[PDB]
Amino acid sequence: QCGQTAPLINERLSYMKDVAGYKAENHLPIEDRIQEEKVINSAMAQAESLGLNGESIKPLMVAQINAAKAIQYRYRADWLSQPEPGWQPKPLDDVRANIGELSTKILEQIAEELKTCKPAEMGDKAHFINTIRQHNLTSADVEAIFSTFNQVKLK
Amino acid sequence: QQCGQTAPLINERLSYMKDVAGYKAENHLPIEDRIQEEKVINSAMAQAESLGLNGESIKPLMVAQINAAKAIQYRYRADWLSQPEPGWQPKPLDDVRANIGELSTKILEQIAEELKTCKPAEMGDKAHFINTIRQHNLTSADVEAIFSTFNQVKLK
């Protein structure tokens, strides 16, 4: 509905421990440029169709990808000295399709929220902070998302 | 100063890892580079040889030190994504790595000396390692792995 974008942003990040685990098992680097460019390109296409700038959307996407990598980097660090036996990563392709599906709802939701309800009723920083909550995610990570989110514009 | 002098060296080795992390981030390079790790392990094992250390007894310590170093680097990569330290600049890699290798030698020389001359009571204990090996982005679990492997190193 309205104020529903931040919960979807948070759901996307809940998948990053699986991405990190899978990458860790297979000794894959966290940063995958071709995967990030695919993410950034589908978002731009989708944003274009929905009547969003387009250019205003890229920083939000980069903010989300950076948050997601920061989560992954800190799992890789922690697992060196504190492996998690019980953690069995889901297959990366499945997790990636769940992540893509969410990015897709995030953009739909941003367009809908922008086209209707007034950015006074749009989420404040304390709501963003309460909503976007993940182990290995810091306030600065959430803040870079919040600040980019508020600069998304229709066009 | 004869016994309990290894930890300060291990700490100084790990103070260079922010520069290595910065070099890697700048170049979009992965933190983990197994070629470089085998090289560091193989050199340490050959030095251990010249110092009267058992070569194979040294590898766990090298593994533990490399893990701590990666842990630090990973943590830096994460932080800079949202908080990027502009005009802190990493030192040139080759200079950083020579310093690291130098410290790596000193650590092995110090361990060999201590093992020859000291009781394992005069040498660093678990609490000494924690209190001495402190760096931003390095945890107590990272240091405890280094301590336990350090005690696995033997003469021969």
Q: Which residues are CB-neighbours of A94 under 8 A, at least 6 positions away?
A: none
Q: How many CA atoms lie within 13 A of A65 on its CB side?
A: 20
**A77 in B contact zone (CB under 8 Å):** yes
Q: What's the rounded Cα separation, in Å, for the pair A110 and A12?
A: 15
Give the residue from A81, A129, A136 with the most B CB atoms within 10 Å of its CB, the best one to mutate: A81
Nearest to A74 among B34, B78, B144 (CB): B78
Closest CA to B154 of B117, B111, B124, B118: B111
Closest CA to B96 of B24, B7, B41, B6: B24
User: What topology does CATH give the domain A1-155?
Assistant: Chorismate Mutase Domain, subunit A (1.20.59)
* Experimental determination approach used: X-ray
Resolution (angstroms) stands at 2.1
User: Phi and psi for A53 in degrees, rounded to 5?
Assistant: -65, 90
**A81 in B contact zone (CB under 8 Å):** yes
- DSSP class per residue in chain A: --S-HHHHHHHHHTTHHHHHHHHHHTT--S--HHHHHHHHHHHHHHHHHHTEESTTTHHHHHHHHHHHHHHHHHHHHHHHHS--TT--PPPHHHHHHHHHHHHHHHHHHHHHHHHSS-TTTS--HHHHHHHS--TT--HHHHHHHHHHHTT-EE-
Domain ranges of chain A: 1-155
**B83 in A contact zone (CB under 8 Å):** yes
CB B133 within 8 A of CB B11: yes
Superfamily holding B1-156: Chorismate mutase (1.20.59.10)
Helix, strand, or coil (residue B84): coil
- In chain A, residues with a C-beta closer than 8 Å to the C-beta of B28 are 31, 33
The sign of the CA dihedral A95, A97, A98, A102 is: positive
Shortest CA distance from A71: residue in chain B: B78
Closest CA to B66 of B36, B106, B25: B36
B53 strand-pairing partners: B155
Q: How many CB atoms lie within 10 A of CB A33?
A: 9
Q: What's the rounded Cα separation, in Å, for the pair A19 and A29?
A: 11
